[PDB]
Ligand binder design. Structure first.
Ligand SMILES: CN(C)C[C@H](O)COc1ccc(Nc2cc(Nc3c(F)cccc3F)ncn2)cc1
Length: 278
């Protein structure tokens, strides 16, 4: 660590600082998290390189402590959304960001690597119009937000799939469009019930096997499903169609990142440059 000079606290899996490499002069994001199985899993992530994945530069395991050195980006999506709350992020930019994130997920998923905790706070953007996934697969290696958690996780599924990331991204997509969180639960049951109140309480018809999930209770209230025209206006039909497929209850019916990239919604995708105030 003597090789790094902290500049400021970027945020809080451990604290993260903006730091400078005393030798190279490189500015990076330093995350202070040591078990062995962890060292191995982390080492694998160092090879998981993609333009839409925040690059893990180095893994420093010294003094029985673990430090992760990441490429540095100046802003996260949460901050950009708050900064664009009065006017809303332009649809072309929303589409560009969604498309890029799906490319990133398609890559990770093709390597059987899941993110597991996607949220606006770990989606980083730069002046070039790029957006990148941060904190990827470290979940396998303050109050935690439940807003983007897939229903199968909330219902006790222990061996969930890549589908959980598609669900989280769908929630973020809706949030960019409406400028309000889709399912802002403040407890596990509030989160589950908010989802049920919007998409309808799941049953064996739409989700075979749901009534046998660990935390499923026959006593769950039965709410009717709401129309997406009401959930995310003024998203057009292509966008609503895609969102509906990203929010399918059955993880096996939920659209994959690869298939989502071919959805008609992206027929006119472009790469606009955002207006960033750094
Ligand atoms: C309260 N508010 C004023 C603070 C700012 O919004 C904070 O603004 C920010 C937000 C993000 C960055 N850049 C990062 C973060 C990161 N890792 C990383 C992450 F992105 C999320 C969680 C864990 C991580 F390790 N890796 C690389 N570059 C800088 C400044």
């Amino acid at each position: 660590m003597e090789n790094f000079q902290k500049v400021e606290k970027i945020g809080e899996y451990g604290v993260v600082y903006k730091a400078r490499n005393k030798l190279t002069g490189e500015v990076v994001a330093l995350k202070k998290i040591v078990p062995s199985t962890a060292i191995r899993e982390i080492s694998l992530l160092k090879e998981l390189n993609h333009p839409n994945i925040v690059k893990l530069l180095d893994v420093i395991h010294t003094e029985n402590k673990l430090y992760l050195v990441f490429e540095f980006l100046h802003q996260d999506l949460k901050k950009f959304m708050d900064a664009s709350a009065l006017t809303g992020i332009p649809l072309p930019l929303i589409k560009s960001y969604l498309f890029q994130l799906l490319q990133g997920l398609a890559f990770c998923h093709s390597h059987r690597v899941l993110h597991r905790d996607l949220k606006p706070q770990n989606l980083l953007i730069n002046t070039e119009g790029a957006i990148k996934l941060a904190d990827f697969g470290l979940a396998r290696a303050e109050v935690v937000t439940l807003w983007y958690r897939a229903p199968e996780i909330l219902l006790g599924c222990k061996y969930y799939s890549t589908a959980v990331d598609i669900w989280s991204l769908g929630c973020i997509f809706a949030e960019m469009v409406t400028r309000r969180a889709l399912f802002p639960g403040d407890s596990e049951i509030d989160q589950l019930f908010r989802i049920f109140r919007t998409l309808g309480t799941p049953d064996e018809v739409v989700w075979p096997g749901v009534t046998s999930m660990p935390d499923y209770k026959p006593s769950f209230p039965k709410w009717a499903r709401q129309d997406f025209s009401k959930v995310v206006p003024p998203l057009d039909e292509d966008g609503r169609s895609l969102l509906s497929q990203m929010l399918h209850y059955d993880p096996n019916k939920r659209i994959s990142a690869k298939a989502a990239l071919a959805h008609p919604f992206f027929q006119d995708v472009t790469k606009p440059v955002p207006h960033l105030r750094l």
